[PDB]
Amino acid sequence: SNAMSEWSRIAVEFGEQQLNLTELEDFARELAYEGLDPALIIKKLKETGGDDWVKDTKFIIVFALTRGNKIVKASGKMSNSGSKRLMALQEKYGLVERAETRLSITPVRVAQSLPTWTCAAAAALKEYLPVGPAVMNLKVENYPPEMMCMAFGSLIPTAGVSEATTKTLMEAYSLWQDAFTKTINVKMRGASKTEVYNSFRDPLHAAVNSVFFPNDVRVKWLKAKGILGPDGVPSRAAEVAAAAYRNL
Amino acid sequence: SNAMSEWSRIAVEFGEQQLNLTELEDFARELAYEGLDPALIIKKLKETGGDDWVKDTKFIIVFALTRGNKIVKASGKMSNSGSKRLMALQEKYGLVERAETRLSITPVRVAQSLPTWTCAAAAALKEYLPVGPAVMNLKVENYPPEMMCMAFGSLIPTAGVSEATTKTLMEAYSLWQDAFTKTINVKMRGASKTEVYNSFRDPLHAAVNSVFFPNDVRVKWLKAKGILGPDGVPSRAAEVAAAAYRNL
Amino acid sequence: SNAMSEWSRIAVEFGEQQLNLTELEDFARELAYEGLDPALIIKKLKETGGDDWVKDTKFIIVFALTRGNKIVKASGKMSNSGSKRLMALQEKYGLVERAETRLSITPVRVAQSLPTWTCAAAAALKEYLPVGPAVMNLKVENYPPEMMCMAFGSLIPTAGVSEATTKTLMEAYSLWQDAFTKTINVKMRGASKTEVYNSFRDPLHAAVNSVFFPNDVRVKWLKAKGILGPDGVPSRAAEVAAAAYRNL
Amino acid sequence: SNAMSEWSRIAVEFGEQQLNLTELEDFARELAYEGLDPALIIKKLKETGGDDWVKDTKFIIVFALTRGNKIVKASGKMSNSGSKRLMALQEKYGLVERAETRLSITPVRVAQSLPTWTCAAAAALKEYLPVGPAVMNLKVENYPPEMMCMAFGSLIPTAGVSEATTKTLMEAYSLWQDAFTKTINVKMRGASKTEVYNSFRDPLHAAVNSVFFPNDVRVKWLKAKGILGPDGVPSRAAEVAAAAYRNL
Amino acid sequence: SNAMSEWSRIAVEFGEQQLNLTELEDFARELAYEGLDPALIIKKLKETGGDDWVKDTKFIIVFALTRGNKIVKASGKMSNSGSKRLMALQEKYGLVERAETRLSITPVRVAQSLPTWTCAAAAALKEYLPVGPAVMNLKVENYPPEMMCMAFGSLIPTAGVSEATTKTLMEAYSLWQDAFTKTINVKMRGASKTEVYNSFRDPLHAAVNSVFFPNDVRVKWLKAKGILGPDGVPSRAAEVAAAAYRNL
Amino acid sequence: SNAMSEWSRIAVEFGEQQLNLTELEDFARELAYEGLDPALIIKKLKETGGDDWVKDTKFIIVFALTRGNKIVKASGKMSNSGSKRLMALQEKYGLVERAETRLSITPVRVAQSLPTWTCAAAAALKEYLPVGPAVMNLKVENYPPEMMCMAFGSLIPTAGVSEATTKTLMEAYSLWQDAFTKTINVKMRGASKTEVYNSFRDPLHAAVNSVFFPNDVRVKWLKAKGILGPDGVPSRAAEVAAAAYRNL
């Protein structure tokens, strides 16, 4: 209430405004990290593939699960049948190895757009994953195999479970992400826990906060897989995994 | 009083002059670190924006709070709606990503020019901040959410509170600045506490010493938020935060 | 079961499909790491060499066992007789020093294509190996000399033995691979156990999972060499080696 | 006294000469490190400035005390009034940022040429110094504020005090120099105590050994400031500071 | 005995062949590391030098023993007489500083081609060696001076002594090689024991395995020097040296 | 005595020759490290300088003692009188900053050519030396000031004293050389004791082994300075210094 300049007064009165929380949360969601647009990816696949899109997509996802995004490098070190088919799919769908643009269709983006399929496939193919049971068995007992892939973050619910459940599932999953990031990213070779976490913090939060894949389907699927119990809280293995990550 | 040359005598007599403290403090304030001119920023926004400037500014501040200054990089990884609006605002206001000049309007400069609004918005949007409750909860209990942003330094008062209060508030805030600097600045990756502090010492002191945002408004606002008690000393959470930083 | 968009519904229904495990394992095998095609190598050798191919191949394998892949560098530091013959063989078979392509015939690829011969030859020539009994005797007692070469991975069976046996043999062999990788690869100079393992994980798993060299021949050969006992479990030396690697 | 060659004999007889100590000390003083010529600096200032030189010089010194030598960089981050005046002074006096030549007028050289004024001004402006009471209060209690600047070395006497007093004052001052060197010089980031000392050893000894600023004026000034007691030995704070540096 | 493809069968039958050990050891010797051809060196020296070759060779060997291979660099820092003669010898014999080719005559190659002379000369000139008694006296007592040079490896016998004796002599010698490698090779500056050993493993084994210098002459010479006792086992000093290397 | 080839026999018989020790020591001295030719330096100085050469040389030596070899860099930071005279001397004698050639006259080479004068001058000017009593007083008590310079090595005798005395004097001197090397050579910044020793081992041994400056003059001078006692063994201070270096 002391005398001030007209520019100071503007700053002061600006800050006396009430916050419009609905509007501020809209803005914050529009400006938040987004790693991919799953509806865009699926639309591109289906429109290009027609009646072959489902079978084609499954093959691309197995590649993403087991070899990642590096199409050319990987195709040089794989069976002839696998390489021929992967190269043909790349030409057919315009697959690329890096997400340069919203339009970029990478194998990992395809996997993340269909997360319930991808994570079931990961569990089924757990013996083929670069970071799978062998690695996780050294860290804890009974790491959920559905968590051993880049798509599991999209299946962690925010609605229909407690915030403690959400946090625990994120931590349990971080145990795999931490390991996968370190094995596959050479820039993380000497990084601290906090540094490797920050390399996947934004993509993980974006996957969890996404509205594309409905929370109720996530909860029901996690219950069916036993990752959540019938009461909607994490299984013992999930709690052990989460504890292991917090302790890391 | 021994014989000396005429040049030595000049140096000696120069040093026998009394100091004009009023004049010396004027000089020292004119020459001190200044990071931005808030009146200049607000004038530019209001003159360009007219009756849209307030709503536009709020959106720019949410961006600054949650994504920082990197307009192009961030716009590549966000919703279409957010990116379209941010790009349009950049063209409209001439927003830039680095403070090259007094005239450079960066998103962070906009936030710092309206600090009471920005810090209230930060608390409201604390779950969206890159360095927010999750990080600070690992360090101490109940870190004030209003301190979780680049603008809080401007709200630390020098008049109307004790110097011990000023120092405590600076230390409590440094706990967040230290963390934020380390997460966002890769050059600080292996830096000591003292090195990361020195990266923000001058901007912080300049914010605290600024005459643009009146001290009495700062005190009243900190009391309203509970960061200061009714007696004008820091809350327990502020003291705990400050202790944690001194101990770091 | 809540209302959702048509793109969300597609993702949801995609994930409600049953997995075709036979088809998914086919895909995963086609896309898995493959380091070489042994039938291709042998066909090239035999078609080029005719009735000289066997004797020629044995000489190339001794080179691979004792000097590795670096044809030019090694030929500069060896007897005249050895160098002359190696250079002539290189011209004759189109030998190269790096596996650039499926077609690239490297000395190590030749050795790996004939693994029972190569590993018997390694044991016979153990005093000539760069990483042989002297190195392994410092780590454990009685390291199997047949394991002291790049081809042993192809002789670890997956069928006809328990999975515990397979795992133990892989670990026992890793003790040599770990040492060999460190001595020969300068990029691994400061690498952790996990980092050097990951440098040979994919080639090792590919050798073990290969269908080219029949599992029943592997089991019978390991029994004949005493690496497996008559009951089909690993010898004591193999168990000690495996324990040493786990403990490393 | 054994037979030797005529060249050996010359070397031997050269070394049998008596030393002319007066002449040798003259040579050693002429060849010793010199960082600046204060009479030259003052002459340039006064001849250029005329009746404005005193007020102009005081402003340049406040800049040197608080911002150092980096005229352009600092002027980009300061008030408009400060920047305008500093730039005008640079043009007027030919100020430069690095001492390339005896003629180079840097802000720090100006401060060092008028050391009693500069150190009194430093104490008066101690709350504005980049390395001031906050930093020194963490190291010891009651660090003399007159020592918190680049000019204090010129005020350490060699005549009129004991050599133990001279040494103690140099050590007490080194405590600040050590800290200032580390904060401002990034090349010293990982340097040992001995390495950072050697970065200022020659300039410090040259300041102490300079004949420009008379020893008797130094002693009298240090007594007036309480840095020396009436008996001409260092105050308790000086002894504590010196002990802290020796212990560092 | 299960059905397999014709390419698999070829690999299987290839491995059922008996090994021809005589032939395999011939191949392994032809392909083994060879560092130099001593007969070639001696032939070149004698044919170029005629009746001056012996005296010339002795001078070249003293250079190799005391200064190594760096002819130009060393000649810049030595007496005029030494430099003039060394340069003339270089022109006369085509001496070079690096073994680029079988034909390259380096000073060290000359020394290694005449190893009994070289090692006797090393002992005689032990006070002139860069790595001599001063260095070795810090490691153990009574290090054999004949071992203090690059040629001693050629005098370690494989026939006429036990394999334990051969191994002990190699280890005793490695104590000097380890030290010499570290002092002269700057790339080994931070290398581990194993890394510096691997830098000389192949040259050392090649020297020991060479058939050029007869084993019976080696044994007799080592007995004459007391490095072997009359029973053909290593002296106490050799055992102490070997123990010191194993313990290093 | 077994049958061998004619080239082997030549190598064997070469090694059966008796050593001519007088001739071998001549060769080893001619080929040994030599850092400078003092007679050449003195001849150049005297022939150029005529009757001014003595006074000129003394000035150059004071420069070498206090500032080293860096003529241009040092002249930029010294009194006008000193710089003018040094530059004139450089032109007059063709002084250079690096010993590129036998002919190169560096200030340090001049000092080393007249070592008894230089070391007496060093003691006289000990308060002006970059590495003097202040540094050495931290290491031991009463370090001989005559040892605080680059020329002292030339005054360590090999004849007229015991070898234990020679060794002790070398070690005592190494304590200063070690310190001086570390302060002045930035490449030695993280070097081990052994690495910094090896940087001056050859120059030191060459100075001690030089025949230019007669041993009897050295002994007599060290006795006159008290570095040797009347019995020709090192003073207590020398023994303490030597012990300190061995312990370093």
Residues 6+ apart with CB under 8 A from B65: B111, B118, B121, B122, B125, B128, B129, B149
Residues A5, A9: Cα–Cα separation, whole Å = 6
Q: Which of F100, B129, E141, C80 is nearest to A24 (CA)?
A: B129
Residues 6+ apart with CB under 8 A from E157: E165, E166, E169, E215, E218, E219, E222
- Residue E95: strand, helix, or coil: strand
With beta carbons under 8 A apart, name residues in chain E contacting C115.
11, 15
* Ramachandran area for residue E36 (φ above 0: left; ψ -120 to 50: alpha; else beta): beta
Residues A115, A106: Cα–Cα separation, whole Å = 15
Residues F122, F137: Cα–Cα separation, whole Å = 16
- Terminal alpha carbon distance of chain E: 52
Residues B83, B63: Cα–Cα separation, whole Å = 10
Q: Do F124 and D27 touch (CB under 8 A)?
A: no
Cross-chain CB nearest to B113 (options A2, A11, A33): A11
Amino acid sitting at position A21 = L
Residues C164, C140: Cα–Cα separation, whole Å = 21
Which uninterrupted H or E stretch holds C197?
Answer: helix C193-209
Name the experiment that determined this structure. Answer: X-ray
* Ramachandran area for residue F139 (φ above 0: left; ψ -120 to 50: alpha; else beta): alpha
With beta carbons under 8 A apart, name residues in chain B contacting D85.
30
Amino acid sitting at position C138 = L
DSSP letter (8 states) at residue B35: -
Q: Do E19 and C85 touch (CB under 8 A)?
A: no
* Count of helix runs (H) and strand runs (E) in chain B: 13, 0
Q: Given CA atoms F52, F58, F61, F62 in this order, what sign does their dihedral have?
A: negative
* Alpha helices in chain E, H assignment, sequence order: 6-14, 21-31, 38-49, 53-67, 71-76, 80-93, 107-113, 115-124, 133-139, 163-184, 193-209, 215-225, 236-247
Q: What is the 3-state secondary structure (H, E, C) of chain D?
A: CCCCCHHHHHHHHHCCCCCCHHHHHHHHHHHCCCCCCHHHHHHHHHHHHHHHHHHHHHHHHHHHHHHCCCHHHHHHCCCHHHHHHHHHHHHHHCECCCCCCCCCECHHHHHHHCHHHHHHHHHHCHHHCCCCHHHHHHHCCCCCHHHCCCCHHHHCCCCCCCHHHHHHHHHHHHHHHHHHHHHHCHHHCCCCHHHHHHHHHHHHHHHHHCCCCCHHHHHHHHHHHCCECCCCCECHHHHHHHHHHHHC
Residues E203, E209: Cα–Cα separation, whole Å = 10
Beta carbons of B3 and B66 less than 8 angstroms apart = no
Which uninterrupted H or E stretch holds F200?
Answer: helix F193-209
CB atoms within 10 A of CB E197: 17
Residues C73, E31: Cα–Cα separation, whole Å = 12
Residues C55, C158: Cα–Cα separation, whole Å = 31
DSSP letter (8 states) at residue E3: -
Token couple for B2 = 């021994």
Residue E214 burial by Cβ neighbours in a 10 Å radius (0-12, 13-18, 19+): buried
Q: Which of E103, E141, E130 is nearest to E237 (CA)?
A: E141
Residues B9, B30: Cα–Cα separation, whole Å = 31
Residue B117 burial by Cβ neighbours in a 10 Å radius (0-12, 13-18, 19+): buried
Q: What is the 3-state secondary structure (H, E, C) of chain A?
A: CCCCCHHHHHHHHHCCCCCCHHHHHHHHHHHCCCCCCHHHHHHHHHHHHHHHHHHHHHHHHHHHHHHCCCHHHHHHCCCHHHHHHHHHHHHHHCECCCCCCCCCECHHHHHHHCHHHHHHHHHHCHHHCCCCHHHHHHHCCCCCHHHCCCCHHHHCCCCCCCHHHHHHHHHHHHHHHHHHHHHHCHHHCCCCHHHHHHHHHHHHHHHHHCCCCCHHHHHHHHHHHCCECCCCCECHHHHHHHHHHHHC
Q: Given CA atoms E152, E155, E156, E162 in this order, what sign does their dihedral have?
A: negative
CB atoms within 10 A of CB A72: 11
| Closest CA of chain B from D97, distance in Å | 16
| Closest CA of chain D from F131, distance in Å | 10
| Closest CA of chain E from C212, distance in Å | 6
Residues F218, F119: Cα–Cα separation, whole Å = 12
Token couple for E137 = 């006296």
Residues F25, F12: Cα–Cα separation, whole Å = 23
Token couple for B75 = 């716009």
- Residue C215: strand, helix, or coil: helix
DSSP letter (8 states) at residue E128: G
In a mutational test of the F interface, the residue from E37, E57, E71, E79 whose CB has the highest number of chain F CBs within 10 Å is E79
The 3-state DSSP composition of chain C as helix, strand, coil percent (nearest 5) reads 70, 0, 30
Beta bridge mates, E105 = E95
φ, ψ (nearest 5 deg) of residue D12 = -65, -50
Residues C203, C154: Cα–Cα separation, whole Å = 10
Which uninterrupted H or E stretch holds C167?
Answer: helix C163-184
φ, ψ (nearest 5 deg) of residue A228 = -105, 145
Cα dist. E223→C28, C87, C195, E237 in Å?
A: 67, 43, 49, 14
Amino acid sitting at position D80 = N
Beta carbons of B242 and B233 less than 8 angstroms apart = no
| Closest CA of chain C from E19, distance in Å | 7
- Chains interfacing with C (3 or more CB pairs < 8 Å): A, E
DSSP letter (8 states) at residue E18: P
Beta carbons of F204 and F142 less than 8 angstroms apart = no
Residues 6+ apart with CB under 8 A from A203: A33, A35, A153
Counting CB pairs under 8 A, whether chains A and D reach 3 or more, is no
* Ramachandran area for residue E65 (φ above 0: left; ψ -120 to 50: alpha; else beta): alpha
In a mutational test of the E interface, the residue from F30, F101, F168 whose CB has the highest number of chain E CBs within 10 Å is F30
Amino acid sitting at position B98 = R
Token couple for F46 = 């005297």
Q: Which of E35, F22, F166 is nearest to C74 (CA)?
A: E35
Beta carbons of D117 and D65 less than 8 angstroms apart = no
Residues F204, F112: Cα–Cα separation, whole Å = 11
Residues E180, B159: Cα–Cα separation, whole Å = 71
- Residue F2: strand, helix, or coil: coil
- Terminal alpha carbon distance of chain A: 52
Beta carbons of A225 and A142 less than 8 angstroms apart = no
Beta carbons of E156 and E172 less than 8 angstroms apart = no
Cα dist. F211→A210, C193, E79, F155, F218 in Å?
A: 87, 57, 12, 11, 11
| Alpha-carbon torsion angle A182, A187, A193, A194, nearest 10 | -140
Cα dist. C148→A73, C58, F141 in Å?
A: 29, 17, 60
Q: Given CA atoms A36, A42, A43, A44 in this order, what sign does their dihedral have?
A: positive
Which uninterrupted H or E stretch holds C23?
Answer: helix C21-31
> Considering just the CA atoms, what is the radius of gyration of chain C in Å?
21
Token couple for B96 = 């830039």
Three-point CA angle E30, E209, C152, nearest 5°: 60
Residues A141, A164: Cα–Cα separation, whole Å = 22
Q: Which of B112, B131, B140, B137 is nearest to B235 (CA)?
A: B140
Beta carbons of C1 and A216 less than 8 angstroms apart = yes
Between helices B53-67 and B80-93, what is the axis angle to 10°?
120
* C158-165 LR contacts (CB < 8 Å, sep 24+): C158/C208, C158/C209, C158/C215, C159/C215, C159/C216, C160/C215, C160/C216, C160/C218, C160/C219, C160/C232, C161/C219, C161/C228, C161/C232, C161/C233, C162/C232, C162/C233, C165/C228, C165/C232, C165/C233, C165/C234
Cross-chain CB nearest to C77 (options E19, E29, E34): E34
- Beta strands (DSSP E) in F82-184 are none
Residues A178, A198: Cα–Cα separation, whole Å = 10
Q: Do E28 and C74 touch (CB under 8 A)?
A: no
Any binding-site annotation on B128? no
Cα dist. D66→B202, B204, C71 in Å?
A: 11, 16, 66
Residues A25, A19: Cα–Cα separation, whole Å = 10
φ, ψ (nearest 5 deg) of residue E95 = -60, 145
Three-point CA angle E189, E194, E199, nearest 5°: 65
- Residue C213: strand, helix, or coil: coil
Residues D10, D8: Cα–Cα separation, whole Å = 5
Q: Given CA atoms C208, C214, C216, C219 in this order, what sign does their dihedral have?
A: negative
Residue D87 burial by Cβ neighbours in a 10 Å radius (0-12, 13-18, 19+): middle
DSSP letter (8 states) at residue E175: H
Instruction: Encode burial over F117-130: b for 16+ CB neighbours within 10 A, e otherwise.
Output: bbbbbbbbbbebbb
Cα dist. B126→B121, B132, B143 in Å?
A: 8, 6, 11
φ, ψ (nearest 5 deg) of residue A95 = -60, 145
Between helices E53-67 and F21-31, what is the axis angle to 10°?
50
- Residue C110: strand, helix, or coil: helix
Q: Which of F215, F228, F208 is nearest to F35 (CA)?
A: F208
Counting CB pairs under 8 A, whether chains E and D reach 3 or more, is no
Token couple for C216 = 């029943």
In a mutational test of the D interface, the residue from B14, B21, B171 whose CB has the highest number of chain D CBs within 10 Å is B14
Beta carbons of D242 and D248 less than 8 angstroms apart = no
Between helices C80-93 and C53-67, what is the axis angle to 10°?
120
Residues 6+ apart with CB under 8 A from A131: A148, A176, A179, A180, A183, A184
DSSP letter (8 states) at residue F126: G
Residues D225, D222: Cα–Cα separation, whole Å = 5
Residues 6+ apart with CB under 8 A from A85: A59, C30
- Residue C7: strand, helix, or coil: helix
Token couple for C242 = 């495996």
Residues C111, E31: Cα–Cα separation, whole Å = 15
The DSSP annotation for E30-65 comes to HHS-----HHHHHHHHHHHHGGGHHHHHHHHHHHHH
Residues C65, C203: Cα–Cα separation, whole Å = 17
